[PDB]
Design a protein around this ligand. Structure first.
Ligand SMILES: [Zn+2]
Ligand SMILES: [Zn+2]
Lengths: 114, 134, 138, 152, 117, 176, 134
């Protein structure tokens, strides 16, 4: 799943196997450089791709004046009463009406979903 | 030993230098002094768990400049010089980055307004003639 | 101890003119440059154009070491200045303006497909198979 | 102090009144034209590269500064006169202002001698003038003055 | 509604350089992720690590008419970590009353002064 | 224009790699792969090009989006080769390689992203902006950023008499 | 509803949680303990693959909800994949009791005994997800 570049010419490293050792290797095309593979997973394709939207949220959104603010959902970390909530509005979800809360307290960008 | 060869003695000495960006007025004052021998004094105050860096403008030059440090891990900066004798040399490696900011909050903008006015002084614009040229 | 409340003050000196101009050499952090291995270094102007209005070319340890090409910074510091502070025994800081800013990017040293040969590989626009084998032929 | 709701309706229409007392209703037209005459025309002339002639003597031409006079009309006898907008409407004239430019002509004759002459205010054409713009004759005329010119 | 006539972005660019904005030619690409891109008239000028302070400063300058003229648009896309500044002509704008702390900055004194326009 | 090819095309190689990004530069008849344009600008190593397109390598979803584009331009691994490739499609055929490279540099220097810069030292500035365009395209494809609305008047300008007249005057003064 | 399922097109993409490709050199200790629990059972007395087996592995995780909605069975999917590719691929799937539905896919042993062995498995992955009809 990870992406690596050869230390020689900083080009994309692609997976390759060695029959003699039967161990996964990452080899650079234009460089002939080789590296020992530690992940063992060439790639993972997520059809559902249920990526946690909380990671995608930016804590700075609390500074948006147009986002609604609720005092009924205190921050779980710092306990601040005021929080700003919004919807994902991210494509490829095929369904999105749940609210994502972000703590409005400065220096506490805590984010959660009820 | 060749003309194209670069001296690396400074790097081998692990020489440390600081990269600082300064405003125009501070540089302009230094240029105005023409290098008399002194333009100010840099003061560094280190506490139990914090460090404070500031620069004081010379009283004669005028007739505070707190310094904010920046992380250097984002880049590797080294200083190289080209001597007039055609002998390139590496002065050293930058070990800290800082920025100089003014102390005035609002009254500083008045100086900028004049500076913008000075910058726009040579901006020529069309002129209106009372009489048709004959 | 004294470090908990250490206070230091140093003077600032701005020499009028210096025999040697000061420039800035920058390398990408991901490049992982190592000055210890820099046994030899050669800095010469590039010859691609064929002087002061051309990019620089940096060669380290001859052909064996990594080769970097320098490019002058496009942006102009008309409203900004850059200075370098160097420690000296007298203890008074010295500020030297930077004549120019240059960015150096490493150059790869390996058999690179020629422009005429790249045309031949263009027929295999997307029908290319086993991308690894392409450089084996070269 | 603070505008109470009982006084907001009057307060807000005092604000709107002052906006139109100043801006009017065709401000976008007039401001755009004023910028073109005041700035764009000068910038276009300045941004033009100097004309270099070489075919030996070398001639350089640089267009320095732009001048614009009042909208003028020339009688068949050649006498200029200010062109009132009403006269332009009646006599089917074009409401245009003469355009002049300062041109500097420097010649290099290869004899290490440079001769520089400036042709101040060289006529280069006529720019149609937007009415009631800064460069229009009606600009800065009181309502009484406009009536004397048969202008509404 | 008013249509912006346009003005030079030079004063804004100079102020941004004076302010703690890192130039695009001097930074490393790794620093762009956390910082917010600064666009002036569609040109990516640099990045800033304190967008909230910069926007407050920019708004203050425009309201005081110090360095930023009235018809200059300052847009901060908080989600996208971008600050877009526009100075060119053809932008449609309208005057709006500023509100701070649920209070109109327009007070009775302004109305009284306008009454005697 | 920076465009991502549709997935409609069916093939063992096309389907596996995904969608590739191509650039429609002015004065070029045919679409140019995006990674070639970055090579012509002076960025050869994949790490360097991706640093201008992807600002956070820790994100794997965006990295996989550019992989098909890297494979498309794998043949071109030099700036001069990339410049020749763009010049080959130029407005006029290039008699020799030197003319092609010079023409390609001419288009990129001034005809491509002129608002970013029109000088010879603006390659880095154009690489960042071109990478931002690719980055913007990736966000749209990934669904992380909504597609822009043509009807939005934020994305609109009104040409009034001034800009209109100035456009005419530039042509007439050049004729003069 | 039985007629509805028999008509509405269902491809492997519809009922697939995710697909991953691992090198998987040793089939016994395939990737992680989760596969170890049931992969051995197939490999205690394996048939039609004792001769050889491709190194690369294509692991498919199938959504339980989607599978239940269409009343699909893992054995049927394996038969469908087997029918489509014949003996070209070897399909191993876990029991329905396990909370996670998995389906390991590899390439024929005869080929193991020209494009590539990992790229080709990638082509099959896309081919099975969209073109293959369940
Ligand atoms: Zn390599
Ligand atoms: Zn909190």
């Amino acid at each position: 799943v990870g992406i690596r570049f050869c230390q020689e010419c900083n080009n994309m490293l692609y997976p390759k196997e060695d029959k003699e050792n039967r161990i996964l290797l990452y080899a650079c095309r234009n460089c002939d450089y080789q590296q020992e593979a530690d992940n063992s997973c060439i790639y993972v394709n997520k059809i559902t791709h249920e990526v946690d939207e909380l990671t995608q949220i930016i804590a700075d959104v609390s500074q948006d004046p147009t986002l609604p603010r609720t005092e009924d959902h205190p921050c779980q970390k710092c306990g601040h009463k005021e929080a700003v909530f919004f919807q994902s509005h991210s494509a490829r979800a095929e369904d999105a009406m749940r609210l994502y809360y972000v703590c409005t307290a400065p220096h506490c960008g805590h984010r959660w979903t009820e | 030993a060749e003309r194209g060869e670069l001296d690396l003695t400074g790097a081998k000495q692990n020489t440390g230098v600081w990269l600082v960006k300064v405003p125009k007025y501070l540089s302009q004052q230094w240029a105005k002094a023409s290098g008399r021998g002194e333009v100010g004094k840099l003061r560094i105050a280190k506490t139990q768990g914090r460090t404070e860096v500031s620069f004081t403008l010379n009283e004669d030059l005028a007739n505070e400049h707190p310094f904010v440090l920046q992380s250097v891990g984002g880049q590797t900066l080294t200083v190289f010089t080209e001597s007039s004798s055609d002998k390139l040399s590496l002065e050293g490696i930058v070990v800290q980055r800082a920025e100089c900011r003014p102390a005035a909050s609002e009254n500083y903008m008045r100086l900028k307004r004049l500076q913008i006015e000075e910058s726009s002084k040579p901006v020529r614009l069309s002129q209106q003639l009372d009489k048709v040229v004959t | 101890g004294p470090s908990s409340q250490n206070v230091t003050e140093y003077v600032v000196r701005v020499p009028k003119n210096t025999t040697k101009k000061y420039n800035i050499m920058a390398f990408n952090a991901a490049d992982k440059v190592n000055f210890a291995t820099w046994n030899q270094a050669r800095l010469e102007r590039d010859l691609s154009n064929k002087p002061e209005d051309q990019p620089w070319l940096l060669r380290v340890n001859g052909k064996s070491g990594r080769k970097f090409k320098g490019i002058k910074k496009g942006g102009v510091t008309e409203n900004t200045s850059y200075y370098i502070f160097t420690q000296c025994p007298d203890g008074a800081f010295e500020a030297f303006p930077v004549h120019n800013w240059y960015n150096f990017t490493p150059l790869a040293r390996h058999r690179t497909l020629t422009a005429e040969e790249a045309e031949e590989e263009w027929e295999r626009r997307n029908k290319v198979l086993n991308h690894f084998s392409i450089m084996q032929q070269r | 102090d603070e505008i109470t709701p009982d006084l907001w309706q009057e307060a807000c229409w005092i604000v709107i009144s002052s906006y139109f007392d100043e801006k009017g209703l065709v401000r976008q037209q007039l401001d755009s034209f004023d910028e073109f005459i005041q700035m764009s025309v000068q910038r276009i002339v300045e941004d033009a590269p100097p004309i270099d002639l070489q075919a030996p003597p070398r001639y350089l031409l640089k267009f320095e500064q732009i001048y614009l006079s009042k909208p003028t009309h020339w009688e068949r006898d050649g006498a200029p006169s200010p062109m009132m907008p009403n006269e332009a409407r009646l006599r089917n004239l074009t409401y245009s202002a003469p355009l002049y430019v300062d041109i500097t002509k420097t010649v290099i004759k290869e004899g290490e001698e440079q001769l520089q002459t400036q042709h101040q205010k060289t006529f280069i054409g006529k720019i149609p003038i937007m009415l009631r713009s800064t460069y229009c004759l009606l600009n800065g005329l009181t309502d009484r003055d406009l009536c004397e010119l048969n202008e509404c | 509604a008013y249509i912006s006539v346009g003005s030079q972005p030079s004063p804004i660019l100079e102020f941004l350089e004076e302010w703690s904005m890192e130039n695009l030619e001097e930074i490393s690409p790794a620093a762009i992720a956390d910082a917010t891109k600064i666009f002036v008239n569609g040109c990516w000028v640099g990045i800033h690590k304190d967008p909230e302070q910069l926007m407050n400063t920019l708004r203050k300058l425009r309201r005081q008419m110090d360095i930023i003229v009235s018809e200059v648009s300052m847009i901060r896309d908080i989600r996208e970590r971008e600050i877009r500044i526009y100075t060119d002509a053809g932008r449609i704008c309208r005057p709006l009353l500023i509100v701070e702390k649920q209070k109109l900055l327009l007070k009775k004194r302004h109305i009284d002064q306008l009454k005697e326009r | 224009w920076v465009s991502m090819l549709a997935r409609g095309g069916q093939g063992a190689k096309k389907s596996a790699i995904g969608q590739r990004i191509v650039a429609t530069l002015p004065y070029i008849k045919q679409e140019v792969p995006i990674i070639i344009v970055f090579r012509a600008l002076g960025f050869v190593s994949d790490r360097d090009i991706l640093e201008h397109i992807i600002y956070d390598f820790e994100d794997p979803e965006m990295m996989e989006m550019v992989k098909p584009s890297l494979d498309e331009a794998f043949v071109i691994q030099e700036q001069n080769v990339a410049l020749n490739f763009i010049g080959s499609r130029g407005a006029k055929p290039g008699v020799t390689k030197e003319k092609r490279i010079k023409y390609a540099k001419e288009v990129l220097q001034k005809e491509m992203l002129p608002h970013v810069g029109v000088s010879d030292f603006c390659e880095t500035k154009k690489a960042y902006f071109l990478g931002y365009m690719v980055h913007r395209l990736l966000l749209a494809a990934l669904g992380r950023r909504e597609l822009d609305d043509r009807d939005h008047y934020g994305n609109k300008r009104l040409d009034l008499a001034g800009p209109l007249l100035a456009f005419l005057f530039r042509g007439m003064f050049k004729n003069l | 509803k039985d007629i509805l399922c028999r008509l509405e097109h269902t491809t492997l993409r519809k009922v697939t949680a995710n697909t991953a490709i691992y090198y998987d050199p040793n089939p016994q200790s395939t990737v992680v303990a989760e596969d170890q629990e049931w992969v051995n059972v197939y490999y205690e007395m394996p048939d039609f693959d004792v001769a050889r087996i491709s190194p690369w592995l294509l692991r498919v995780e199938l959504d339980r909800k989607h599978m239940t909605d269409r009343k699909l069975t893992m054995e049927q999917i394996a038969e469908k994949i087997n029918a489509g590719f014949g003996d070209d691929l070897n399909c191993i799937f876990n029991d329905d009791n396990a909370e996670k539905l998995v389906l390991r896919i590899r390439i024929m042993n005869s080929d193991e005994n020209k494009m590539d062995d990992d790229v080709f498995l990638r082509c099959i992955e896309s081919n099975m997800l969209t073109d293959m009809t369940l």
